[PDB]
């Protein structure tokens, strides 16, 4: 199914994007618990 | 920001493109970051976690933790784009459909989606009462809105939820009173320098996943930043007492 394939690529892109953005937030949170 | 997916799944070009635009602005590495994901020849496929099932070997706390562990594995959603449209004044029936779809698509969630997933996943332990606890907080010139699923079972209070912060979501079933639970969140917010402005407690959520009743989200509204703590306690215990031993008519009705 095209739609199933697209939904698997979108899911892998979402979780790749998510870990990047969680890492950004945790650095900026940590660096704020500094300053 | 305030981007919510209203196209279902697969996500549509407009929402997808709007997602990548937003994160290109927020992330220091900008387009190198986006381009590197979107042009990947091949992406490792994230494993799909099984939906918890209640087992005879589990205590109630085991079951709540199993549910909470499922949500943590879904991951808190930091993409800017909420993937499941929650229309919280929907009848429980429609929200329970959106919850099963969270289970099927298996993407990251934020706090309101998590509340709805907790209801869905506990709609079958009737000794588990569920009720939304909402917060309005202030921090550094801005207001914030957060919600968790309060639970009450066998004389104790706890909660399920999702949040960036590990101290603003799940709480075990060891709080003897509603006040103790709410004050723990308030003290958890103090750590992050958030002042609580408003606390709103809902009604018990009916256990019928086919109900046409909406969740009542604002049965009790406390302007806590303007109240002394003893009066917060008196109000919360009076209302907790009510919901343990009454059938309160939804405030949103009368």
Residue numbers in the entry:
A (entry chain B): 26 to 60
B (entry chain A): 48 to 301
Paper text:
In this cycle, the C-terminal tyrosine is removed by tubulin carboxypeptidase (TCP) and can be religated by tubulin tyrosine ligase (TTL). SVBP plays a chaperone-like role by extensively interacting with VASH2 and stabilizing the α1- and α2- helices. A positively charged groove around the catalytic pocket on VASH2 is found to target the tubulin tail for detyrosination.
Poor electron density of some residues of VASH2 (1–48 and 300–355) and some residues of SVBP (1–25 and 61–66) are unable to be generated a well-built model, indicating they are likely to be flexible. To improve the structure resolution, we prepared a complex of N-terminal truncated VASH247–355 and the full-length SVBP1–66 for crystallization, and determined the crystal structure of the VASH247–355/SVBP1–66 heterodimer at 2.2 Å resolution by molecular replacement using the VASH21–355/SVBP1–66 structure as search model. These two structures are almost identical, with a root mean square deviation (RMSD) of 0.28.
